[PDB]
Amino acid sequence: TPASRYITDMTIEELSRDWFMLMPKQKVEGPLCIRIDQAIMDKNIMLKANFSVIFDRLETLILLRAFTEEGAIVGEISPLPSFPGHTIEDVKNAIGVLIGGLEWNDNTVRVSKTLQRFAWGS
């Protein structure tokens, strides 16, 4: 995978930073794993992701995480390794579930320019 097909919204530090859930919820959407801290409310959030793009659209997700304006990780979608792989639809489902959960607790979720461009496109 080249750098003309590799989007890194997240720094190395961001990708690997440990984060804890006061009120943990976890879900599975396809071969994907979803995490929100249910303790978070009333914040602006931004979903950022690292992933590879082919034929103008997301191919493989490495990691997505939810960031408060303050710079804190309040959620995550992550790939489980399995034989099917995982599809752009899995990812797009996962994102809707993340977003749904975040807003349910009165947060406002935005998605990165690149996730708009390649996955959350319409």
27: which strand partners?
Answer: 34
Q: What is the CATH number of the domain that holds 8?
A: 3.30.420.330
Residue 37: how many CB atoms within 10 A of its CB? 22
Tokens of 32: 């994907």
Q: At how many Å resolution was this determined?
A: 2.6
Query: What CA–CA distances, in Å, run from 73 to 18, 68, 77?
Result: 9, 7, 11
Determination approach = X-ray
CA distances from 108 to 35, 54, 118, 119 (A): 17, 30, 21, 19
Could you list the residue range(s) of the whole structural domain that residue 18 is in? 1-122
The number of distinct structural domains making up the chain is: 1
Around Cβ 29, how many Cβ atoms within 10 Å?
19
